[model samples]
Target: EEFDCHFLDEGFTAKDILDQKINEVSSSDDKDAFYVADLGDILKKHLRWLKALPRVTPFYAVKCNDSKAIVKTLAATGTGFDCASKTEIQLVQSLGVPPERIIYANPCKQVSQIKYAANNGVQMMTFDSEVELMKVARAHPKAKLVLRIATDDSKAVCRLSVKFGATLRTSRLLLERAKELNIDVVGVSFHVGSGCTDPETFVQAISDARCVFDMGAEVGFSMYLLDIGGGFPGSEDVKLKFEEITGVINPALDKYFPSDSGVRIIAEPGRYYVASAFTLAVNIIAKKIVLKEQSSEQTFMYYVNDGVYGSFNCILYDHAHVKPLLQKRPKPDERYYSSSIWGPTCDGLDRIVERCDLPEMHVGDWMLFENMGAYTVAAASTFNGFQRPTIYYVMSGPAWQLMQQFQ
Candidate 1:
C-alpha cells in the first residue's frame, strides 16, 4: 500500500510533517505562503482505480473537486463530466470537454440554464417531474431527457428520494407525457443513495428501472439509456467492493434487458472515483481548558489553520467523523489521550472531530485524513477571513523534476 516515498513511519506521525512545514513557512522571508499539494500520487492512484473498473464511461462529477488542474488531468483520460450548474458546465467546457461530453445531471433546472444547455448543443439533462418536463420542453425542446426515478433507500447517508426523483408510477406518466410533447425521453435514471453499503441496493434499483422501462415500451417510448446514478462505494474499507456490489446489479441488468438491446448504460460515481485519492493535511494551533472535578484540566484541543468554515465543513454539515493522520507526537511516557480537533474560527460549531485519540501535539503540528477529497473541498467557505488550506500534489517521482517542470 505504500507509495510516493511513504512519508510516515512508526516514529514520525502526521504532527511532524505539520511542524516542519510550519517552521519552514514561519522562518521563511517569502510573503505569499502556501503548502505543497501532493496530488500526483493521489491522482495516479485514482486513475489506476478508474482504469480497473468495468469498461463503462466515467463522468467525473465536476462538483467533487473542481480544481482546474485536476479537471484537465482527468480530461486527458477521456472522462466526461457530470455538471449540476451552469458554472460547472462552463468549467468543463473550458477544459475542452465538448457539449456531448457533459451531462447536465441536475434533475432540477432553471429556465435560463435550460436555454443555455440547448444553445450550447448540450443534449442530455435529467428530469423528475411533470412540471420540470414542461419547463424543459419549452426551454430546451431538442434536449435528450432522462426520467429520474426515486429509488427507495431509507438507510442512505445522503438521501435524494423524497425531494428529487419522480416515483415509479409517476415515471410512467412522465415518459408518456414526454412522448406526447415529442421530447426525446431516451433513458431512466436513479440514485441508490451515496455511501450505500448494501450491494443489493443497486440490483433492486436496476430491477425497478427495468420495470419502468417495460412500462415505457408499453406506452410506445423507446428507452435507450439506463443511468444507474452515483452511489457506488468509494471507501478504502474492504466492505464496499465494486465487484461484490456490481456482481448483483450487472446480472439483474442482463436478466432484465438483453445485452444487445443498444440501451447505453451509464453511472455517475462521485465519491468512488475521488474519495481515497486525496487527504487533507491541517496544521494544529493551540489547546483549550475544560472544567471538570472543580479544576481546570487542560483539554488538548488542537485547532488547525483550516476549519468547518473551509475544507472541513463536512464535520458540521454531515456530522462526519474524520480520521487523523498525526504528524508529530509527544514523549512515549506522556501517553496518548482523546481530544477534540477544532477549526481556526470563532464559531463554536466549527469542530472537526468530536473526540479522537492522539498523542500530546503542539502548535504547528500536522494531521491528515484519507478520503477527504469528496465534499470537503467542494464545500469550503472563506468565512471569518480564514484562508483556505493549501492543496499539494504528491507522486512517486523526482520531487525536483516536479518543481522544475510544474513550477
Candidate 2:
C-alpha cells in the first residue's frame, strides 16, 4: 500500500521515466521486470469519461486493479468505487473513502463478508437470487439491495451471466421474496460481460433494466438507481471505441431513464480508466534459436522475467492478447526474424507471444508491453518464486497540480 512516486516536470512522460529505469538497471544486476504508470493518463481518462457519459456516475471496479495509488487517484477525482469483496471495501475505506461512495457490486457474497459490509456501513450491495436476499435480510437489515438481472453476455469475451445474474422470471421471484423478507429493494443492475464488442447489447440490457424497474414498481418497491455494469473497452486497439459505446448508451438512457426520471444512473468501469496508464517492461533473461529443416529463417525464443502466471495473467483471465515492443530501437535496415516470447516460469505453458517478429533480441534486453494496467497486477501472483513487477508511479507537473486541486 505504501510506495514512493516520482513526480515529473513538463514534457516528461511515463515512457521517459521507463527509459531512465532501464538505463539504471542495464548496468546492474537488478534487471527485474517493472511497470511505469502515468497517473496523469488516468486523470485524462476520468475527464474523458465525464465528457462521454455525463449522466452516468463512474464507480471504478477495484477488482480490476486495486493499487493504492490508483485507488487514491480515483478517490481524489471524486469517483465512486465498485468493490467485490470485504477486502476491496476495506481498502477503499482505509483511504478515507466514505461508505456511501462504495458499492459491494458482487451478486454472490460470503455471510461473514456481508456482516463486514454491514459493520462498515457499506449499505449498497447487489443480489440476484432468493437465497442472497435472505442472506442480506439477516446480515444487513439496512442494506440497499440492487437486483442483478442477466444480460445477453454471449457476445462478451469473458461472459459472466453464466455464473452471476438472475433471469427476468427469477428476478421477479427474488423481488417477491425481498418484499416478504421486508428487505429494501432500491435498484436494478446488470453486466453485458467484460470486453463487450456490441454496443447494441448495452441498449438491450438498458431496456431490460427498465422492464425490471417497472416490475419492481408493480411489487410496490420504487427503484431509484440503475447500475449499468462494466464492459467498456480499455485501449484504442479494440474494435469498439469508448465514445462509440457511450454514444449508443446516452440515447438509450435518455429513452429509458431520462434526465427527468429521478433515477440515478451509474456504471462500473474497470479497465477503461487504468489499462492504458500502465506500461510493463520485462527483461529478456534468456534466449534460444532453432533452425528449421526446410527454412533458412531461424525461430527465436526470448524468455522474459514476467509471464502468464504473473502480470500476464490477464491473457488467461481477461482473454487479453499482447504484443511486445523493443526497448532498444532497431536500425532502419534491421532485418526482423520470427520470434517467440516466453515467461520466466518453469511450466511449458508460461508463454507470452506464440509468434512475433523482432530484430534479434538478446538476454538482458527489455521488452515493453503497453496497456498492462487493468486485470494485470490485481490478479498477479508470486508463482514459481517470481515476484511481481515493481510499479513506478509518475505524474507531470500540470497533472500533479490538477490532482492537488481535486483534493
Candidate 3:
C-alpha cells in the first residue's frame, strides 16, 4: 500500500523520490504527465525565512500555488497569506487561518470583493490611488489601508511598477486625500517587482517606505504596518538563495524600522515558497529528425505529451528558463546532438524547447523538468483539447507523518 505506514527520510532528494515513485506507481495503461510537490521543500523555505528574515513575517502569496496540500502545510507552519481576491481570502479562511493571518494585498479592488472582505471580518487591505481610496471609504470605511508605492524594478523579471504602484509625487496627494476622507491609512507597502535580483532594491524600497511614514505622520495618521511586497526569485534555473535577500532585508529592517519603531513588518512572497519544490515528468509521444547534407550536425524534433498549453506555459508567460532532463544521463563519451522539443498540440507556437544539446531518445521515453511549481500550471490552460497534467504531492518530516495520519 502506498499508504502503508513506513519511516520517511527528511533527506530524500526529488530525484530519489521520483525514482522511487516511477517504479511503484499504478499499473495498466497509465500514460499521463504529472507534477510532484515536496512538502519538505516548503518546510525548508519556511525554516530559511525564519533563520534569515526573522523580523519580517512571511505572508505567503496564495496566488503562487494554492494547492490544498501546500496551503494546509503552510497553515500548520504558522505562515500567513497574501490574497488578491475574495476567493483567495476564502481559501485561506477555509483552512482555519483567522483574518489576522491574511493580508488583502491587491492594490486594486472590485466593489464586491471589498464588501466580501468587510463582511468576513478581514480588515487589512491595500490601495494605491484616490478613486480606490474613496471606494474603500464608501464600501468598507473601517478597512486598514496600506498605500502601495512604486520602487525601482530594473532587475526583476516581471516589472510590476508599470501597472499598479503609486509614485512618490502621487503618494503625497493620495495620503492627503485619505486624510480628507478620514480613511484609516495604517501603513505602506511596496513590491520591488517579481524575481527581484538586486538586494539594494529592497533597501531602497524600505527607505522610501520610511519616508512615506513621515508623510502619513504629517497627515496625522499613526503609521504602523509595513508590507514589503513579494518579488523573490523562485526558479531552480536561477538557483537563488533566499538568504541572500534576507542578508540585505534584515539589516535594512534593523536600520530603518527597528523593534522600537512599533511597526509590524510582513512580506508577500509568491514563488519563493514553491519553486524548487515541484518537478514535472512527461512522456515522449512522437519523434522526427532532419539531417544536414555532408555534415555531422543534425536537427531533431521530439514531441512530448505536454507543451505551452500545459505546465510548460511558464516559458511563454513568465520568461522562464527550462532545461529538459533525460531519464538517464548520457555517458561521458556519448555524442551530443541538437534537438528540439515540442508539445502535443496543433498550435505551431506550442514548442517547449527551441534547441538543446541532448542525447538521442525514443518514443515512450520519459523527460523530466525541475522547478515546475510556481507560474507553470498556475497560468497554463487546456488549449487545443489537450488535458492538463495531474499534480501529485510528497511530504517529508512532520509534514509527511501528519499527512499520512489524515489519509
Candidate 4:
C-alpha cells in the first residue's frame, strides 16, 4: 500500500519528467542512466486489455518485469500473477495478494519451491512431465495442476515450448499419471511462445487445449480452466497488434469452448502489460568518430553507462531490438550518420544497438530508449561493476484516481 509515485498534474507528461531528471543530473558527474516509468501507462494497458478481450482474464507474468511498483499496481487492478520462481511468489504475497490469485506457471520446479507453495497455500501451478507430477505429489499433494502442452512455436520470435510443454500424447500420459497419484488435474495450458507472430498459432493451441480437456474428461477429471499462456505483443510496433491477435483468439475460444461451456479462461500476459510503460535515458558517457577514407561521411560510436549487463539485458535474453532517440530536438537540415550504441562495460560484446542512424551528439548528451519495461530490468546483472539504472515511478492525476477505484 505504500508504493512511491510522483503524480503529474495537467499539462505534464513523462517526457517532462525525463527532461527534469536530465537537468538535475546536468549539474554533476552523476550523469548515470535511469528509467522514467509511467505507472499510468500500465493502468491504460489494463483498460485496453479489458476492452479487447473482455472474457479472458490476464495473470501478469512477474518474470517479465518484477518491479515492486509494477506488481503492486497490477494487483490493485485485480490481475492475477503468473510467478515462475519461489522469490516471485514471495514478492506477490508480500503485497497482500491472496494465494488463489497466484499461479506458479513454471513447468519445472524445484522441490523446495513446491513445498513453499504448499506452505503458503499457493495450490495452482503448471507442469508437463511425470517427474514434475511426482515432485508435486511428494511436496504438495493437494496442488491443483494444469497440464502444459507444447504448441507449434515456429512462428514466434522466442520459442518457449522447446524447453517445456508436453505433446498431446504426453498430455494423456501425464493426466493418467496425475489420476494414479490422486493429484487434482484442474486445467490445461499452452504457450504459443513469446513474441508470437501468427494469430493462427493461438487458434491451433486453443483447439489442442480442447483436445486435452476432452482427454482429461475421459480420465474422469473435471478440467474447467484453460490458460492460454503469454506470447501477446507488448508494443504496437509489431506487425500484429494486441487487439488483432485477440480478434482471432476470441473467435477461436468461442468455437472451441463457448461462453456457456462453464470454463474459466485466463491468460498469462508478460510483455503485453509492462513493455511500453518504461522509457530509459542513458547519457553518452563516451563517444568516438570513425572517418571514412577518401569519403566525407563518418560513422559514430556512442557509449552509455547501462549496457547489456545492465538494463538492456533483454537484448541478449529476450532477443529484443532497441532504437535510440535523441533527447535534444534536431534542427532542420541536421545530418544523420551511421551510429552504433555501446554499453559502459569494457567488453566488445556489450553493444546495445549495432547500427542505427543518429545525429552527432556530445558525451554529455542523453539518448532515450522506449519500451524498456518487460524483460529488460528483471534479468539485468551488475556485471563489469556497472550498477543498474535508478527508476522513477510516475502517474497522471486521473490515472492515480482511477487506480484508487481499483484498490
> Residue-pair clashes per candidate, as listed?
23, 0, 0, 0
Residue 119 in model 1: lDDT: 86
TM-score attained by model 4: 0.96
Mind giving the per-residue lDDT tens digits that candidate 3 earns over 1-407? 23222234767665776666666643534667877777767777777777777788999989888878778778888888999998899988998889899899888889999999999989999989988998999999999999998888574356544777888879999999988988898999998866566788899999999899988888798989999988787753554456677688888998999889799999998898899888898888898878855633477789999998888888877778888997675678887788999999998888999989887777777789988888887787888888887776766567565444422
Q: Rate the local accuracy (lDDT) of all candidates.
A: 0.71, 0.89, 0.82, 0.89
TM-score of each: 0.85, 0.96, 0.91, 0.96
RMSD of each: 5.4, 2.0, 3.5, 2.1
Name the Cα RMSD for model 4. Answer: 2.1
Summarize candidate 1's per-residue lDDT along 308-391 as a digit string, tens digits: 888778776644567887644446676666688887889898887888777767665566676677777789878999877666
lDDT of 4 by residue, 1-407 (tens): 46558898698999999999898877788898889999999999999998999989899989889989999989999899999888999999999999989989998999988898899889999999999988998999988989998888574356445788899998888889988999999898998866565789999999998999999999999989999998888888788888888899998998998879899999999999999989999989888889855634598888999988888888887888888898797789899988889989989899988999988888899999999898898888898788888899999988988788777
Candidate 2 — which pairs collide? none
Give the C-alpha lDDT of model 1: 0.71
Predicted structure 3: clash tally: 0
Count of clashing pairs, candidate 1 = 23
TM-score of 1: 0.85
- Per-residue lDDT of 318-352 in model 2, one digit per residue for the tens? 88989789878778899988888988999999999
